[PDB]
């Protein structure tokens, strides 16, 4: 039940971008965005 948070490019500020939305940052209008790290379990052997 997440609105699908993305990280802006030149801003680095979390924006909520739903499907059928143009990828534009809420501020400055930059078009490059990155998905935030997963919430799933991340475990490594440290080997």
């Amino acid at each position: 039940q997440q609105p699908m948070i993305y990280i802006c490019g030149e801003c680095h500020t979390e924006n909520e971008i739903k499907s059928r939305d143009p990828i534009r940052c809420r501020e400055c209008g930059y078009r490059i965005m990155y998905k935030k790290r997963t919430k799933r379990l991340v475990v490594f052997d440290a080997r």
Partner: protein, 419 residues
């Protein structure tokens, strides 16, 4: 389009480049004296090949302008440094003038396949087929010309304790034994990034492509993959472990709907590093996904030296199993001695000897080819001051029985590259 190169001018048997220029040039940080002033003062000149047929060229002033019985006595130019005849990949080779020329050519070819940090902004680039070492190192023995190649800042390889010995038969026929314990410690560990690009489109009046988690109740043509790994976005999340036939981008094209998703290439097995979403020239949604994969060096990986010594890892032994010196030094890579005699890569041996002096003296050794002030005997005299056999050999103890092996093994730091 005329290819030409700079040369020093010689008016009588004397260079036009006097100490005042070197002194001003040495200060070029404070005062901005530079190459332009050297050219403008008429000390340097760009000679072209067609013009070079009529210039009489010395190689080094300090010997070819004095005389015993005059050879030329009318030089017009002088080489800056004869090592400037090499290119970019050919000038990272230490002691190339001690190697058979095909070996130099093969190293020039392989120097473009050696992994390392290929650029400092590699975490920003969504490049296809990117490889970066965990711990690349500056070579212990360098040419003076690799400073301009900036190889010291973006190197591709690791200095490894190479023991050129026929050990237990797997370091055989161009292969190399590696130290499993060294690998565990990250020796030659690299990460491989693969990038997947995908864009949505208006296929037509009737058909449209969109990123969505495919669902079997609506999508036909689905496969056995776990689409649930995708979030509602339809794009895999950064930090999620993926494997062969896993869906990466859930694209669906309406007809109810056909599953037109893009899947990870078969047998890749990586972890999603980052996912970027944007718009292309056409203003449609477009996303580049980069998947990282840690590649621990295993058996069959091709490792090469800076002298043309390509070889696959034949087997990996634990440190308990590797041969060891009077102290706990085991080789990181054991290379077959039969690689040297026919290929005559003596520059390899000279590197393995000077790297030893470099690691003991605490200075990066100089292996510029036409030095004439750096010969094997002087290196050996240096090496014997540090309590070593002057030729680089050592008394190795067999790792399996602990008994000394009757032949003293040639061993020393050598800059090895991972292809």
């Amino acid at each position: 389009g005329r290819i030409c190169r700079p040369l020093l001018i010689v008016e009588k048997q004397k260079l036009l480049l006097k100490k005042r220029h070197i002194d001003q040039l040495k200060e070029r940080e404070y005062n901005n004296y530079s190459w332009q002033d050297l050219v403008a003062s008429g000390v340097v000149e760009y000679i072209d090949t067609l013009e070079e047929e009529t210039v009489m060229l010395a190689m080094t002033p300090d010997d070819l302008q004095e005389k015993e019985v005059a050879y030329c006595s009318t030089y017009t130019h002088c080489e800056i440094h004869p090592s400037m005849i090499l290119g970019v990949c050919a000038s990272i080779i230490p002691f190339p003038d001690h190697n058979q020329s095909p070996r130099n050519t093969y190293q020039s070819a392989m120097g473009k396949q050696a992994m390392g940090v290929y650029i400092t902004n590699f975490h920003v680039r969504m490049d296809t087929l990117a490889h970066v070492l965990y711990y690349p190192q500056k070579p212990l023995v360098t040419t003076r010309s690799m400073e301009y190649l900036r190889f010291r800042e973006l190197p591709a390889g690791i200095n490894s304790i190479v023991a050129i010995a026929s050990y237990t038969g797997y370091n055989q026929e161009d292969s190399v034994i590696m130290n499993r314990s060294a690998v565990d410690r990250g020796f030659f560990r690299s990460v491989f990034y693969r990038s997947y690009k995908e864009q949505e489109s208006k296929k037509g009046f009737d058909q449209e492509e969109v990123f969505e988690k495919p669902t079997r109740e609506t999508c036909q043509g689905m496969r056995h993959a776990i689409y649930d790994k995708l979030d509602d976005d339809g794009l895999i999340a950064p930090g999620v472990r993926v494997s062969g036939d896993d869906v990466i981008i859930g694209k669906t094209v309406t007809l109810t709907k056909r599953d037109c998703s893009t899947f990870l290439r078969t047998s890749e097995t990586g972890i999603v590093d980052q996912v970027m979403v944007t718009l292309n020239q056409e203003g449609y949604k477009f996303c580049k996904i980069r998947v990282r994969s840690v590649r621990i060096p295993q058996i069959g990986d091709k490792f090469a030296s800076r002298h043309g010594q390509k070889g696959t890892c034949g087997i990996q032994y634990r440190q308990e199993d590797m041969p060891f010196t009077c102290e706990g030094i085991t080789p990181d890579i054991i290379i077959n001695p039969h690689a040297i005699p026919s290929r005559m890569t003596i520059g390899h041996l000279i590197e393995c000897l000077q790297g030893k002096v470099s690691a003991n003296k605490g200075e990066i050794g100089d292996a510029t080819p036409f030095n004439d002030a750096v010969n094997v005997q002087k290196i050996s005299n240096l090496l014997s001051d540090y309590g070593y056999h002057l030729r680089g050999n050592e008394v190795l103890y067999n790792g399996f029985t602990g008994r000394k092996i009757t032949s003293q093994i040639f061993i020393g730091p050598t800059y090895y590259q991972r292809l």
